[PDB]
Symmetry: C3
Subunit: 134 residues, 3 copies
């Protein structure tokens, strides 16, 4: 029900979509062709920008299946997209396989985007946890 406004910065890519109604995330595609040699990383453009609602957070997870099979991961997983970030979502892909290079083609699914509420907690410093109402 909650709406996620999304802009296809690169109109040549398919609009991300939820494969199944209950799926936690939507796959993001790569806007560029990139080849990751064993152990190497790259900041890859997804060609999309989103407006995560205040009080929520966008999270970029690596995909399972073949992606995991070949050792594709994300350096800063879970990628954190803040409510105020309106820029292009980029994925810090990293090939965790010791010998087999990973070839990323433009249009390839490289990650999945989830949206969850986040507790924008107010940090209150205390000398110790022996505080009433902790």
């Amino acid at each position: 029900s909650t709406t996620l406004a999304i802009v296809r910065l690169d109109p040549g890519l398919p609009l991300p979509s939820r494969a199944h109604d209950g799926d936690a995330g939507v796959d993001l595609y790569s806007a560029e062709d990139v080849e990751l040699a064993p152990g190497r990383r790259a900041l890859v453009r997804t060609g999309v920008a989103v407006a995560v609602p205040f009080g929520m957070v966008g999270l970029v997870h690596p995909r399972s299946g073949l992606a995991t099979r070949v050792g594709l991961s994300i350096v800063n997983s879970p990628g954190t997209i803040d409510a105020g970030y309106r820029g292009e979502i980029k994925v810090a892909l990293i090939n965790l396989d010791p010998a087999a290079p990973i070839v990323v083609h433009r249009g390839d699914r490289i990650a999945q985007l989830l949206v969850q509420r986040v507790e924008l907690v107010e940090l209150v410093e205390v000398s110790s946890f022996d505080e009433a109402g902790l």
Copy 2:
């Protein structure tokens, strides 16, 4: 209070359990014996299947403590278990240590499973973020 129906596909393993009432996750065990050489990964069976409620998501995190001490991690962390996935939870374990192999014994805790609500957002494409009601 929310219920998580779980099936022990492998009855020989202990039923996952929450060590402490407030703990975010429950440890999942390995149904198989596997030895991860430095830098190598493996898709390991947990011997369990769960029914994550619609509107929620199951998340598989690496464990802290000794697991972290030896460099055990998860390729696609956080492992994403969708509300519709009723299959066996498998963990893409990876030994991130450069020289010390990691031996996983059947019955060993290999990860922890958390359950959180997820915002099944409806993506609405827009030409730009200069939209009323964004």
Copy 3:
């Protein structure tokens, strides 16, 4: 609005803070000087302890930007801080770059802490998912 009681175990470090009102996390600093050689990891002290509310969970994510640029990651990401954990938050940093060492200085931002609600689900074992009220 939700309060997060925090103790600066090391008073010499800045109190973690939310850079922007809607930011999902607050940066945690390193209380120690540490140099991570390529592929090596270390359990680094943040000099802070927090009281995550019951029903919630603290999550430690790697930071984006330069941190990702140099290949700094977290072995057990997302770091899971349970509601009952009142000890010092430590970050299992790992240099995922193959050749460039990462130098962590005392006072350097090494990760970000988020707080989210977590479903403290009650696991109910079932022989199969063909259960009424699943």
